[PDB]
């Protein structure tokens, strides 16, 4: 009908203006030149580092990446950090400068961006879901499938709606990160006696649905975000109904949002929601 | 009836905790146990 239109697998190309860099622009590349298997000799990326990252906080790796081991769990200052990439080939280390090389393609920008750790920045996202129900108690049904509903926060930095989540701190696991990020972002201040135990009841059953590479605009050639997605589903809906949603920390507003395929969310969160609906045979 | 099919002992415990406000968990457990012991025989309780 069409005639072999709209490629084969449309790759990811980050936007031209780097976020929060004061107008610093990357080196623009076409989507058929992005992968690392392809040679692409006309490639001159720009090296840019944020002043916040260059000021050396606690969550930032050192500026000289020598002696650091990638693709394995590495101990920095006695705290475990998981530098394992979800890419099957793994992460390759450049011999000239010691910087890691992104296996998921070119992003038109070298150096360490807004991300504090060289290589894989492991992020954890928390998708707290419940079935979308009418006042009568009947489950809403669209396209012959049951309809989901998830907690979404409006980000402070770019005012786009997104799934709550954040970078894994040093010496902590994905469990703590997921719970801590949900209480900090979606809930703000944190939980009333049994209501808190009820939330614990909500938090006792989580399934890792995906561990994928993020289409995050802050990604560079030497620092990229890879996410582990944890779904907390409330089958009965009792625990979900006791949550008092109120935006805190780096989130402006938080709300319950119906899950569908036309959602315009930050980074690759639509893929994460697709994985959640694929696992629970829900509408998407 | 269908509207009582979503009733659970956890929500009952939550209702007792929000209403009476016990000092200790054992007191809440004892009140819940006594409440369940009252309505064991369906003939002896009539709810209007």
């Amino acid at each position: 009908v069409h005639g072999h239109t709209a490629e084969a697998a449309e790759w990811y190309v980050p936007p031209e203006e780097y976020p929060k860099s004061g107008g610093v622009k990357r080196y623009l590349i076409d989507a058929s030149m992005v992968p690392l298997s392809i040679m692409c000799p006309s490639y001159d990326p720009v090296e840019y580092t944020h002043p916040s990252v260059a000021a050396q906080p606690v969550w930032a790796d050192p500026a000289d990446p020598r002696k650091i081991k990638f693709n394995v769990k590495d101990e920095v200052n006695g705290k475990v950090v998981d530098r394992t990439s979800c890419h099957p080939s793994g992460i390759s280390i450049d011999s000239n400068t010691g910087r890691p090389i992104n296996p998921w393609g070119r992003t038109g920008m070298t150096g360490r961006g807004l991300l504090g750790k060289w290589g894989v920045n492991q992020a954890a996202d928390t998708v707290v879901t419940r079935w979308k129900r009418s006042p009568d108690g009947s489950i809403l049904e669209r396209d012959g499938k049951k309809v989901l509903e998830f907690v979404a926060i409006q980000r402070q930095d770019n005012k786009m709606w997104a799934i709550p989540g954040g970078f894994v701190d040093n010496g902590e696991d994905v469990a703590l990160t997921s719970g801590r990020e949900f209480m900090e972002e979606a809930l703000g201040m944190g939980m009333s006696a049994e209501s808190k135990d009820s939330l614990a009841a909500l938090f006792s059953s989580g399934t890792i649905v995906a561990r994928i590479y993020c289409e995050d605009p802050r990604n560079t050639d030497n620092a990229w975000v890879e996410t582990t997605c944890v779904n907390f589903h409330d089958e009965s809906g009792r625990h979900a109904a006791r949550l008092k949603l109120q935006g805190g920390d780096d989130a402006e507003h938080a709300r319950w949002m119906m899950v569908h395929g036309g959602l315009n969310l930050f980074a690759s969160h639509r893929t994460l929601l697709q994985h959640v609906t694929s696992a629970l045979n829900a509408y998407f | 009836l269908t509207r009582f099919k979503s009733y659970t002992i956890d929500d009952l415990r939550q209702k007792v905790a929000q209403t009476f406000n016990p000092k200790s968990s054992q007191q809440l457990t004892n009140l819940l146990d006594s409440a369940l012991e009252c309505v064991q025989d369906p003939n002896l309780v009539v709810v209007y």
Binding site: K146, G206, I208 | -
Partner: peptide
């Protein structure tokens, strides 16, 4: 409504309570 309720109920484990 009883049938509506009946037909409704007819259609990597991780514990994050430590947070």
């Amino acid at each position: 409504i009883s049938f509506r309720f009946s037909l409704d109920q007819q259609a990597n484990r991780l514990n994050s309570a430590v947070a």
